[PDB]
Structure formats: structure tokens, C-alpha cells
Amino acid sequence: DWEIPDGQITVGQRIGSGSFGTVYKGKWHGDVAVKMLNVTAPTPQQLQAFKNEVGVLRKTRHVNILLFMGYSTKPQLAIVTQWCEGSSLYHHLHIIETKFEMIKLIDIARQTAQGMDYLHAKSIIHRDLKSNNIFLHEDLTVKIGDFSGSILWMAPEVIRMQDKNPYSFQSDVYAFGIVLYELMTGQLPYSNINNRDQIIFMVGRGYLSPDLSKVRSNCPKAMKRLMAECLKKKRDERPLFPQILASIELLARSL
Ligand SMILES: CC(C)(C)c1nc(-c2cccc(NS(=O)(=O)c3c(F)cccc3F)c2F)c(-c2ccnc(N)n2)s1
Numbered sequence: 001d002w003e004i005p006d007g008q009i010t011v012g013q014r015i016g017s018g019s020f021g022t023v024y025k026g027k028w029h030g031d032v033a034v035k036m037l038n039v040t041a042p043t044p045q046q047l048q049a050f051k052n053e054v055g056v057l058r059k060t061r062h063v064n065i066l067l068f069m070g071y072s073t074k075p076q077l078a079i080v081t082q083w084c085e086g087s088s089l090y091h092h093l094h095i096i097e098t099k100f101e102m103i104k105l106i107d108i109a110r111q112t113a114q115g116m117d118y119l120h121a122k123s124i125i126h127r128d129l130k131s132n133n134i135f136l137h138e139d140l141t142v143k144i145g146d147f148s149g150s151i152l153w154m155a156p157e158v159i160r161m162q163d164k165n166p167y168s169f170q171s172d173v174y175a176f177g178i179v180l181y182e183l184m185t186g187q188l189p190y191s192n193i194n195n196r197d198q199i200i201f202m203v204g205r206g207y208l209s210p211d212l213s214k215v216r217s218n219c220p221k222a223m224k225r226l227m228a229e230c231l232k233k234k235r236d237e238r239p240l241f242p243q244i245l246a247s248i249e250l251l252a253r254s255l
């Protein structure tokens, strides 16, 4: 049903690529983002794999999740989504250095906690959550998307990854903790470790978790506790997003 005829899609300039596909700004009844997959003439085992991915994205309707809009097969395999007018959270924290007040910081965390709560409720695991995947639409509304190398958000257990299935709900919770670290400190974790291979090594064996003493003076005390609980070493000792969301939903009212 969601099959959009291509000729309507005016493909524009290239935005870039990440963990999935190559992204372009486009037009389809207004501004849209167009994610090319670079698959020419799909084999039935690729068309079904494409429809399996579409089937997962189709299952998301939430104001904090990036709005899936359609998909094309001719001339190329592509996914059309809403266009976010703004900049990523990573961009605001480590590129622009935007002066967010604490009210705004906790707000961004709350919207992300709801989107993650929605995703987990629909049994969807992000697997690559990070501040670059938190798009601040109109510098107000969080839009989560972009479902190699980006280890600062990887949990310890994702370093095994050869026995069973290491990506879990708890692994998404850990990545959310790192986003909280960025929000409350203004920095990426492990600022003084100038070599990735040792970060991978340390976090993997577990002798390394971010320094919760870089947090800004006005960081709430419950936020400190929540960060520590999300960044706990063992999978099973991390809180689910229903508890995370509820904890933040109390902090915003106190603030
Ligand atoms: C810079 C980087 C990281 C390469 C980007 N990828 C997308 C992008 C574009 C389209 C889809 C998805 N994510 S997705 O493919 O996994 C997805 C859907 F295709 C549909 C619904 C939800 C969803 F997460 C994206 F991350 C970006 C993007 C998305 C929306 N608006 C803007 N301005 N940029 S940016």
C-alpha cells in the first residue's frame, strides 16, 4: 500500500550516510528525507528483506519517532520519511555548543525516553541510539531515527557478540545513559582516553564507565542516580524505559 510511485519523488542534494542506507533531501507533497539503499534489480530474497524492514518502520506512529511516509521499488529501493528542519543533538552539544538551560535539557531527555518507551512497547530495538540519531525538529521536538564504529554508546555486553543476541532492551537503556551523560556534562564520555581500541577493551571487560563527576552544578540529584542506574554494568540490573520515563516525568515537575 505504502508504495509511492517514484517520478513524484524529486531527489535533491546528498545529506550523507550512516548505519543504514544513504540519505537525501527530497520532495513529495513537501519536504521529505529520502533514504536510498543502492539495490538495483532486487532478488526476491532482497525484496522480501526490504518489505521486512518496511514492515518494522510501518509499525511506528509516534510524535517522537521519525515519521515513516512511504517506500519505492522502481527505479531504486528507497524509504521516504518526514524532513526534520533543525540539527542533531550531537550537533547542538559538540558543534554549536548551544546554551540549553536545565529545563530544556531534561525536556530533550523526556521526549527521547517516550520514543524509546514506544519503540520497546512495539518490541523494536534501536541498536544504534546516540546523540547523532536524536534530531531536534524545529529545535523543540525530538525525532529518533537511523535504526562499524561508534563505540561511546555501546554497552559492555555488545562486545561479546558471537554467542547469542547481545542487542537487547537493556543495551538500548545503556545508550540512553550515555546520551544523558552528554546532556548533563556537555561532553562526550572518556574525554581523556585518546585511543578507541582501549575504550572498546575497557568497557568490554567492565573496568570503565563514564565519570559522573563532570555533570553541571545544577544537575538534579535524581538525574545522577538515573544515569548511574542506566550505566550499570550488568544487563539485568538496568531499569526499563517505563521506569526511566516515570523517573524523568517526576523530575520535570519538580524543576
Ligand atoms: C546524518 C544521518 C545520520 C546520516 C541521517 N540519517 C537520516 C535518516 C533519513 C531517513 C530515515 C532515517 N532513519 S530510518 O531509516 O531507520 C527510519 C525510517 F526510514 C522510517 C521511520 C523511522 C526511522 F527511524 C534516518 F536516520 C537523517 C534525517 C532524517 C530526517 N530529517 C533529516 N533532516 N535528516 S540524517
Ligand SMILES: [Cl-]
Pocket (backbone or CB within 6 Å): 058
Ligand atoms: Cl499501515
